[PDB]
Design a binder for this molecule. Structure first.
Ligand SMILES: Nc1ncnc2c1ncn2[C@@H]1O[C@H](COP(=O)(O)CP(=O)(O)OP(=O)(O)O)[C@@H](O)[C@H]1O
Ligand SMILES: Nc1ncnc2c1ncn2[C@@H]1O[C@H](COP(=O)(O)CP(=O)(O)OP(=O)(O)O)[C@@H](O)[C@H]1O
Ligand SMILES: [Zn+2]
Ligand SMILES: [Zn+2]
Lengths: 339, 336
């Protein structure tokens, strides 16, 4: 039963002791003696070693070594030796350190991604960015859904498209560009525009729908109603001008749905104002939303960490430093998924 | 003279009264009478109108109209009509308008700017393409590394058939395909010592995402303070996306301002030298996106970059954003 120090752990001289690890799992250990001991025991696991083989080379008392071993193990700084049983030349090897760092076997996450099927409903700015992440991360099957054609104004956010692509179907060029990046996956396209609730029946079953299409105004309400009735997982992502939005991620029976937590003259005026609405699109906002959405899809399917947007619609601001989550937990009294 | 309603304005009935605006400027107006008066005033500007003309068009008293007009005007829900002006960058125009800038003037500032991309990996790929398609006039790409198959997970400009080619080379080609209106430049360089930074050209700003050695950004900091050179750092610490600081000579603190045993150190240095980040495209892309937002804003001058005086971290396994103060230090070791 070998263990090996993760390649993603770093330690630093800091404060009265030091830091162990990098990122979300970073620990500040205030006691210098303990921290120095943690370093000494980590060093013993640089090569793949059983507990007792590493202990043999440690110059500290067994009880101190044992405590440090446990610390390292619980945070996945040391990982089973087999979790490093893949070639450095594997195209997905960088994601592997990421999987390892959450205590998962990267070969098993990869196999889950390989066998998954994802629907990209909406192939604009969000769909462009989500689809390449999912494609190059090894999701086995991607189905691109969109009826629109590429324009010159798309080139701002829609990173797969070029000047030369103007006039072609979006789904056509994305497929071309996805397969140029990862030819070991399968990519299909459906030419569909969702005019009515009934149109959603032409969208295929999948592990998850990535929904970024936002026309008409109640498209999401149709998608949610449909997915509740079809028992189909979906995630929403987009933006409200300068705020990046992703979530909720809907899982049948395991999470709340979109609807759970929800003068004629002026009424005419509101409607006209809203009819003329066009979002202040901004690539960085689009990209943040799409990045975090894809992370939640990879985690939903990989199963190695909890998706952020379970039971939540998450907003990330671009002009102030702010995240806010909006409660979208299950309501027993919901008219869509309820009693 | 003339004022027009922004297309990015959204309006909903909510609770007591309603909401005016979408996104960061979204405002709850409790007073329903004031809420209705706002929409009555806004409605007269859907089609461009002068102050006085809209007053005679609205069915509300001159005092209520002045209040609602100022409300819309200060929040940039209504803008000067000339700002309204199909275009390549027409999409970004609503963004600049929403912050009370003339898009044409912002667009011009971008057209006249030079950006250095110091590091053409994951962060470089994504930063450079946002900048190119937003219309930064000159982009200088700097890297001495070749494309590998393992790059394709997050280095979005690169395909399988590009493996073995130079990064600067392929980024340039792909940038030019997406925006032919700009000029792209490459330099084959790797920063081996602090003294190699003199070979980096003068720009409006440096995007620093190079991450070898550990002390690269420390070198970059000291040089940029010396060269009077604006720079912004961006990257990640495993699962945490990082951007900032944005160093502006004479305005902000530098990277080293707030500074935010034989047997042991030998083992530390051996462990640390084996380090490899747990890279993850989503984390790459957030850092790069928010960094690119700060560059556009710094150069476009229409909003304050978020990372002035701050190193910002966005968590990926938690809903969390945290900021470290990098304000000016008089007793700093590099500047001050
Ligand atoms: N009902 C629908 N059925 C199929 N596709 C739709 C759709 N509504 C929108 N889409 C597609 O989904 C993408 C996003 O659409 P919307 O966000 O509603 C307006 P947009 O600003 O054109 O999005 P974009 O910026 O992502 O292109 C577009 O490519 C569009 O073609
Ligand atoms: N001193 C230096 N001078 C110039 N460029 C540098 C540099 N150090 C690093 N870089 C460049 O900055 C980029 C950083 O790339 P990243 O995507 O952050 C990690 P990577 O090393 O590309 O991934 P890998 O570990 O899978 O190879 C690389 O393209 C690298 O060539
Ligand atoms: Zn419900
Ligand atoms: Zn300083």
């Amino acid at each position: 039963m070998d263990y090996i120090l993760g390649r993603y752990v770093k330690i630093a001289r800091y404060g009265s002791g030091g830091l162990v690890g990098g990122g979300g799992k970073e620990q500040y250990v205030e006691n210098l003696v303990l921290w120095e001991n943690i370093i000494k025991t980590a060093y013993c696991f640089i090569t793949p070693s059983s507990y007792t083989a590493a202990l043999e080379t440690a110059n500290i008392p067994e009880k101190d070594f044992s405590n440090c071993f446990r610390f390292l193990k619980e945070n996945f700084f040391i990982i089973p030796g087999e979790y490093n049983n893949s070639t450095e030349n594997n195209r997905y090897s960088r994601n592997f350190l990421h999987y390892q760092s959450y205590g998962a076997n990267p070969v098993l996450v990869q196999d889950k991604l390989k066998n998954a099927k994802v629907v990209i409903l909406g192939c604009g700015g969000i769909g462009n960015h989500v689809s390449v992440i999912l494609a190059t991360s090894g999701i086995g099957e991607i189905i691109l859904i969109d009826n629109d054609q590429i324009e010159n104004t798309n080139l701002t956010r829609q990173v797969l498209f070029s000047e030369d692509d103007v006039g072609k179907n979006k789904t056509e060029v994305i497929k071309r560009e996805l397969l140029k990046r990862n030819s070991e996956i399968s990519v299909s396209e459906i030419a569909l525009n969702i005019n009515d609730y009934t149109d959603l029946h032409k969208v295929p079953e999948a592990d998850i729908w990535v929904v970024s299409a936002d026309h008409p105004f109640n498209l999401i309400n149709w998608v949610n109603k449909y997915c509740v009735r079809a028992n189909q997982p979906y995630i929403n992502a987009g933006y409200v001008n300068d705020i990046a939005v992703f979530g909720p991620l809907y899982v049948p029976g395991k999470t709340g749905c979109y609807e759970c937590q929800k003068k004629e003259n002026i009424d005419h005026k509101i409607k006209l104002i809203n009819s003329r609405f066009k979002p202040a699109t901004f690539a960085p906002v689009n990209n943040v939303a799409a990045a975090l959405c894809a992370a939640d899809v990879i985690k939903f399917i990989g199963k190695y960490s909890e998706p952020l947007s379970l039971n939540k619609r998450i907003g990330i601001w671009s002009d102030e430093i702010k995240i806010h989550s909006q409660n979208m937990g299950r309501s027993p009294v919901c008219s869509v998924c309820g009693n």
